[PDB]
Design a protein around this ligand. Structure first.
Ligand SMILES: OC[C@H]1O[C@@H]2O[C@H]3[C@H](O)[C@@H](O)[C@@H](O[C@H]4[C@H](O)[C@@H](O)[C@@H](O[C@H]5[C@@H](O)[C@@H](O)[C@@H](O[C@H]6[C@H](O)[C@@H](O)[C@@H](O[C@H]7[C@H](O)[C@@H](O)[C@@H](O[C@H]8[C@H](O)[C@@H](O)[C@@H](O[C@H]1[C@H](O)[C@H]2O)O[C@@H]8CO)O[C@@H]7CO)O[C@@H]6CO)O[C@@H]5CO)O[C@@H]4CO)O[C@@H]3CO
Ligand SMILES: OC[C@H]1O[C@@](CO)(O[C@H]2O[C@H](CO)[C@@H](O)[C@H](O)[C@H]2O)[C@@H](O)[C@@H]1O
Ligand SMILES: OC[C@H]1O[C@@](CO)(O[C@H]2O[C@H](CO)[C@@H](O)[C@H](O)[C@H]2O)[C@@H](O)[C@@H]1O
Ligand SMILES: [Ca+2]
Ligand SMILES: [Ca+2]
Ligand SMILES: [Ca+2]
Ligand SMILES: [Ca+2]
Ligand SMILES: [Zn+2]
Length: 435
């Protein structure tokens, strides 16, 4: 990749959103975007589930039917998945790899859908658990492979009305990851580097742990909970990273309501994943399931300058926000951001913090202003004592340097928040002459 790799905390692009254009053109669409994402500093792409789903040509992938049909068997009324053919998928992966970018597959293994009806002794009724017809001929299944069964009635959670998979059955382990013939092995064989596990609240962390024992690779789990204790417990149990939903709702509370103290308080009190373990937190401003933050500029300024591993939402980058402003923030993340963090000042509409630097990365000062007027303030930032500092976004109207006195004091400024008029409500500073 152009800067940091995925394994080194590099920026991730979520390469989709809910109900992307059907017509089997999305792998190709993504493939065409990657040279640009590369130039932008993106380290890896998270793609939607690739298998043939119950919904066939219009499935978003979260109702998997034939795990080993990546869009090449005529099934569920289509050959290709919503996103394209197996060949197109392979092509995109190959392109990604030509640009030193990694591909993170979306793994949906809580449940399955589109099975035929069959008598189920354990339920004393009929269930849609007959998967004998799968065209790949791999990982057929029946009622024994779902809950409830002879082993037990159920597990930590279910999703939709979809048959709920019993990972405790040898057959299911073998086919999903525990063999050279498994679904994991198959993805890995076509170049999948890394993993995003869907709805990990639905089954035990040992599943993900054993998957990673077999296959390795960077991994994140979607554990949708604001309870940081429960999220991290799962992260440490599974060995995987976790999406920071806690931060997400806190950024909404703060940036959409001029209530920055709600964010600061959550950071200080360990009520975000990132402020408790920045090596586990995968941060984001929106995803395909939820998009409640209207005030995205400060939210992106935050996650691209603060600790953690940030994700860019496809729609935000490609449609809704100023792409060049995001490229800039990605540049800042990869060239300046590093080190521990100190909050320098905050109130209802202002947030200033310093990153103290680490390795090659000098560190930085971020200044978020939610107010409708330009903001300026004396702040004590001893990290930069006696140094020329330069503003790296251009948000103050051009080239701006300032001098941090030996005393540690500087008069820092941030533009008004008024995006309609090119005023984006943040400035970012570091030593002069970095790049
Ligand atoms: O540089 C990449 C990075 O940038 C961000 O990280 C910053 C933090 O957010 C910020 O708080 C500060 O980190 C400090 C930290 O919070 C303190 O607790 C302390 O760290 C101690 C201590 O916690 C202790 O455990 C030990 O650390 C050891 C490990 O225990 C050991 O296993 C190994 O660590 C490796 C990992 O285990 C691998 O997973 C791997 O990690 C990477 C991440 O997963 C990743 O997302 C990314 O990190 C960024 C992060 O998300 C940002 O928020 O890149 C990774 C690095 O390649 O690889 C490593 C290394 O081989 O070894 C380490 C020590 O090197 O001892 C600690 C102190 O040495 O102190 C700090 C530092 O101030 O600063 C950073 C860095 O910018
Ligand atoms: O278990 C999947 C595994 O089988 C291999 C060959 O050993 O590929 C076969 O199965 C794939 C999935 O249905 C087919 O697409 C492929 O054409 C077929 O040879 C491995 O490639 C794969 O990992
Ligand atoms: O790193 C190899 C190996 O370590 C595990 C934990 O067993 O994951 C750790 O390392 C990852 C990459 O550095 C981190 O992202 C992860 O959070 C951490 O637990 C395995 O998953 C991985 O195969
Ligand atoms: Ca196609
Ligand atoms: Ca389940
Ligand atoms: Ca909101
Ligand atoms: Ca104020
Ligand atoms: Zn079970």
């Amino acid at each position: 990749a152009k800067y940091s790799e995925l394994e080194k905390g590099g920026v991730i692009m979520q390469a989709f959103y809910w109900d992307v254009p059907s017509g089997g053109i999305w792998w190709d669409t993504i493939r065409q975007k990657i040279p640009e994402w590369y130039d932008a500093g993106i380290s890896a792409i998270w793609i939607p589930p690739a298998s043939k789903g119950m919904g066939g040509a219009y499935s978003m992938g979260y109702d998997p039917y034939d795990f080993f049909d990546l869009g090449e068997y005529d099934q569920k009324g289509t050959v290709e998945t919503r996103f394209g053919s197996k060949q197109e998928l392979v092509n995109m992966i190959n392109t990604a790899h030509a640009y030193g970018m990694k591909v993170i597959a979306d793994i949906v293994i809580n449940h399955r859908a589109g099975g035929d009806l069959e008598w189920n002794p354990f339920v004393n009724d009929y269930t849609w658990t007959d998967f004998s017809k799968v065209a790949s001929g791999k990982y057929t299944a029946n009622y024994l492979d779902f809950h409830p069964n002879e082993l037990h009635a159920g597990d930590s959670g279910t999703f939709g009305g979809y048959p709920d998979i019993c990972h405790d059955k040898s057959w299911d382990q073998y086919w999903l990851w525990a063999s050279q013939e498994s679904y994991a092995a198959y993805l890995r064989s076509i170049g999948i580097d890394a993993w995003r596990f869907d709805y990990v609240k639905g089954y035990a962390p040992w599943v993900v742990k054993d998957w990673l024992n077999w296959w390795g690779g960077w991994a994140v789990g979607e554990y949708w909970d604001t309870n940081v204790d429960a999220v991290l417990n799962w992260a440490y149990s599974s060995g995987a990273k976790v999406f920071d939903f806690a931060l997400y709702y806190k950024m909404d509370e703060a940036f959409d309501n001029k209530n920055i103290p709600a964010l600061v308080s959550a950071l200080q009190n360990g009520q975000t994943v990132v402020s408790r373990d920045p090596f586990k937190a995968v941060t984001f401003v929106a995803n395909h399931d939820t998009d409640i933050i209207w005030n995205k500029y400060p939210a992106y300024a935050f996650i691209l300058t603060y600790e953690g591993q940030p994700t860019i939402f496809y729609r935000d980058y490609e449609e809704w926000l100023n792409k060049d402003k995001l490229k800039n923030l990605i540049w800042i993340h990869e060239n300046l951001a590093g080190g521990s963090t100190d909050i320098v000042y905050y109130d209802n509409d202002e947030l200033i913090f310093v990153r103290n630097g680490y390795g090659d990365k000098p560190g930085l000062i971020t200044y978020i202003n939610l107010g409708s007027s330009k903001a300026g303030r004396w702040v004590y930032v001893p990290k930069f004592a006696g140094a020329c500092i330069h503003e790296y976004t251009g948000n103050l109207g051009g080239w701006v340097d300032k001098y941090v006195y030996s005393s540690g004091w500087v008069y820092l400024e941030a533009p008004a928040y008024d995006p309609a008029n090119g005023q984006y409500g943040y400035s970012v500073w570091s030593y002069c002459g970095v790049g």
